[PDB]
Amino acid sequence: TDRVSVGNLRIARVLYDFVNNEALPGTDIDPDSFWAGVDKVVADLTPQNQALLNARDELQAQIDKWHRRRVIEPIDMDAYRQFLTEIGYLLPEPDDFTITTSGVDAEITTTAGPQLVVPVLNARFALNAANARWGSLYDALYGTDVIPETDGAEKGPTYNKVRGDKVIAYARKFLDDSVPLSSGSFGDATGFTVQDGQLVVALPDKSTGLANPGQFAGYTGAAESPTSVLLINHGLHIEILIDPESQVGTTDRAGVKDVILESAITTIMDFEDSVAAVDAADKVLGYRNWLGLNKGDLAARVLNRDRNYTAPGGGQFTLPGRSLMFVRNVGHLMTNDAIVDTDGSEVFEGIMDALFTGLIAIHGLKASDVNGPLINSRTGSIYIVKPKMHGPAEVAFTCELFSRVEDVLGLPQNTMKIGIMDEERRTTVNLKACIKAAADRVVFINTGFLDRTGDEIHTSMEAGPMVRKGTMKSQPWILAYEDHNVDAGLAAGFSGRAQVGKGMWTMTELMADMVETKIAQPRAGASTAWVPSPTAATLHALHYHQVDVAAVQQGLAGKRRATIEQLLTIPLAKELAWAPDEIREEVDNNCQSILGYVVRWVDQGVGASKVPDIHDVALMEDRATLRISSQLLANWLRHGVITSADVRASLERMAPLVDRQNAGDVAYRPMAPNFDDSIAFLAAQELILSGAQQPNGYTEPILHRRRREFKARAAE
Ligand SMILES: O=C([O-])c1ccc[nH]1
Ligand SMILES: [Mg+2]
Ligand SMILES: [Mg+2]
Numbered sequence: 001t002d003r004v005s006v007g008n009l010r011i012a013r014v015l016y017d018f019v020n021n022e023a024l025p026g027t028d029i030d031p032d033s034f035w036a037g038v039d040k041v042v043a044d045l046t047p048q049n050q051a052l053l054n055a056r057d058e059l060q061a062q063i064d065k066w067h068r069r070r071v072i073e074p075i076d077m078d079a080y081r082q083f084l085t086e087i088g089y090l091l092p093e094p095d096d097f098t099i100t101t102s103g104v105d106a107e108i109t110t111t112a113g114p115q116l117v118v119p120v121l122n123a124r125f126a127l128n129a130a131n132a133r134w135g136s137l138y139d140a141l142y143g144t145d146v147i148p149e150t151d152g153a154e155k156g157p158t159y160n161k162v163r164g165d166k167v168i169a170y171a172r173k174f175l176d177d178s179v180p181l182s183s184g185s186f187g188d189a190t191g192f193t194v195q196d197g198q199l200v201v202a203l204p205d206k207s208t209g210l211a212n213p214g215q216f217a218g219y220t221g222a223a224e225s226p227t228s229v230l231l232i233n234h235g236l237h238i239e240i241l242i243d244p245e246s247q248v249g250t251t252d253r254a255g256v257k258d259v260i261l262e263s264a265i266t267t268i269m270d271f272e273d274s275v276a277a278v279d280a281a282d283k284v285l286g287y288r289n290w291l292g293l294n295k296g297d298l299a300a301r302v303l304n305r306d307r308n309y310t311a312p313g314g315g316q317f318t319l320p321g322r323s324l325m326f327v328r329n330v331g332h333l334m335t336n337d338a339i340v341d342t343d344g345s346e347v348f349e350g351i352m353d354a355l356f357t358g359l360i361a362i363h364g365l366k367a368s369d370v371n372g373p374l375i376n377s378r379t380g381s382i383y384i385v386k387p388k389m390h391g392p393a394e395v396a397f398t399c400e401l402f403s404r405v406e407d408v409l410g411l412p413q414n415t416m417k418i419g420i421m422d423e424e425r426r427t428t429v430n431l432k433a434c435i436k437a438a439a440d441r442v443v444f445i446n447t448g449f450l451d452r453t454g455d456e457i458h459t460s461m462e463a464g465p466m467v468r469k470g471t472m473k474s475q476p477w478i479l480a481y482e483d484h485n486v487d488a489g490l491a492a493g494f495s496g497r498a499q500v501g502k503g504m505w506t507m508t509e510l511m512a513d514m515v516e517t518k519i520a521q522p523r524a525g526a527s528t529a530w531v532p533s534p535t536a537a538t539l540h541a542l543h544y545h546q547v548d549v550a551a552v553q554q555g556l557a558g559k560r561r562a563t564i565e566q567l568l569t570i571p572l573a574k575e576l577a578w579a580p581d582e583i584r585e586e587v588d589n590n591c592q593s594i595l596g597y598v599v600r601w602v603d604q605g606v607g608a609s610k611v612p613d614i615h616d617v618a619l620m621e622d623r624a625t626l627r628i629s630s631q632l633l634a635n636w637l638r639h640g641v642i643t644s645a646d647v648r649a650s651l652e653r654m655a656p657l658v659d660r661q662n663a664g665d666v667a668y669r670p671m672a673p674n675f676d677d678s679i680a681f682l683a684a685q686e687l688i689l690s691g692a693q694q695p696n697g698y699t700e701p702i703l704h705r706r707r708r709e710f711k712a713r714a715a716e
């Protein structure tokens with residue numbers, strides 16, 4: 001139609017122009033050979049990609065059949081596990097080894113701290129995350145519920161001094177716990193001066209330096225009365241801003257205006273579950289943003305420059321002002337019409353992503369203006385997160401794909417590093433082998449709730465009814481999965497070399513609860529964890545100051561805290577474990593999760609936002625929320641727990657609920673009462689009723705189709 005012919009490919013014009021006009025210039029890759037490479041790589045790797053997807057299907061069918069031919073008391077783990085080994089699901093574990101990945105930035109190998117994930121299609125959000133390397137601690141405490149809004153300390157229309165003073169005292173205590181004075185407390189500090197390269201803090205009666213003088217990293221302005229003071233603890237920077245003339249400064253004993261924390265050390269720019277991209281137009285929007293980020297020129301309003309400091313011993317240095325960027329590609333499943341072949345077949349979206357996000361990322365290894373000076377990776381690496389892989393063969397393929405892209409791009413081999421997401425059972429039980437498959441490219445493994453539970457449900461769909469969604473969070477299989485992931489990471493030498501990450505805090509407004517509970521993640525040996533906002537990044541940073549992750553990691557070394565049996569413990573529900581009203585609540589719960597998420601996705605192409613749940617708690621979940629919820633319902637429908645009338649009834653009374661939760665949104669169009677007119681509603685209905693049939697429970701085939709449907713209707 002409006003496509004460009006390159007060998008066997010018919011490339012969508014919008015994509016072809018974008019690449020020639022925006023992505024290629026400055027890379028010194030010849031446009032003609034770039035496209036011949038796209039054509040070659042797509043032709044060479046497409047059959048293996050598809051072979052892998054059929055492998056998934058062959059394995060699931062065998063497992064479905066195993067449960068079906070069985071009666072059978074509870075499952076015999078010797079039998080189950082022997083079966084899994086026979087069919088090639090459970091592969092033998094390789095001998096110990098250390099990963100050999102190199103050329104990796106210090107933000108990933110060394111520094112422990114928060115990690116942001118943001119929809120790359122949203123330019124404002126993406127710029128915010130990139131700028132979230134540094135955040136105001138005062139703003140974070142004042143603005144959220146960490147400082148509780150009791151009587152007197154309420155956020156008003158204007159400054160509340162009672163609340164402000166609380167904020168100040170919270171931070172002072174943090175200073176004391178993080179960068180202690182030889183004697184006294186920051187709570188009594190009256191001033192700061194840099195004297196003989198040391199930091200000197202003035203107390204009402206005396207003066208003192210730091211217990212560990214070396215925690216002093218620098219300052220701004222004159223040593224004799226600095227405008228700010230730079231500290232360091234556990235690899236992370238803390239900056240005390242000093243200005244008596246500022247609105248908070250006047251109130252402060254030492255003229256302190258704010259405390260700034262190094263927060264989001266790295267950010268993942270996401271093309272997968274947090275965005276809605278169903279065609280060439282949507283992909284180009286994403287690719288364009290990814291390009292602006294890497295060239296430094298994205299504006300929505302710009303990217304921050306690095307920060308200037310004076311060394312304690314007089315010199316004059318810089319710190320990065322931007323979060324170091326990963327990109328998350330889509331996984332192996334989906335195709336996309338941005339390129340079709342002569343036959344009209346869509347091309348695998350994962351393959352395209354490597355080619356185009358890899359091409360684009362070259363700009364980030366280069367001076368940004370194009371004069372200067374920002375850059376992403378200074379060590380010369382491109383950092384790609386790859387989600388939803390199943391097993392070491394799927395990881396090997398991603399490496400081979402990267403190898404071939406690097407060739408087309410003229411990059412050295414292994415420039416393209418992989419972040420291995422551990423969110424599918426066949427990866428979890430073969431984790432060590434997956435890490436070995438990428439032993440020279442891997443910079444990251446991580447765990448999460450949503451996708452991994454959905455796969456857990458879909459895999460054992462035929463075994464019986466599963467426990468509630470809430471129950472899933474604390475089942476034996478997931479707790480083993482969490483620990484087993486750290487163990488594999490630490491045993492492959494990730495400490496000092498690569499990130500070991502944990503899941504997203506989805507409750508954007510529940511910051512007090514986050515600060516209280518998310519500390520478990522670094523205590524479990526995770527050198528990074530996912531946060532929903534720059535504000536959450538700043539608050540989660542506190543955890544890394546309280547917890548010596550490096551030491552925690554050294555302590556876990558050599559431990560084996562999860563057995564294959566634990567990992568293989570299917571979350572089946574006990575002999576009829578729910579009262580009727582409990583069943584209804586769970587059904588409502590899941591139907592609302594789907595409706596609330598689906599409606600924004602199908603109608604508006606939003607893949608991530610603050611979606612009020614059934615109790616009006618704001619959650620920022622990604623598409624994986626659709627996978628658990630619909631799989632759970634599909635499972636319950638499959639095993640007689642609920643009826644199809646139950647599902648339709650729930651959908652019909654949760655729908656208008658969702659409507660009014662989206663009241664105050666001008667573009668929003670309600671689903672109720674003409675349900676079978678809403679494409680969103682029908683998408684929700686299809687996810688559930690077709691759920692047991694989606695490959696590995698994946699929701700994109702259905703979601704993408706319905707979103708495309710909607711876009712077509714809107715085009716009249
Ligand atoms: O909850 C999550 O996994 C998530 C990632 C990005 C936005 N939400
Ligand atoms: Mg996921
Ligand atoms: Mg310590």
Ligand SMILES: [Mg+2]
Nearest residue numbers: 692693694695
């Ligand atoms: Mg199936």
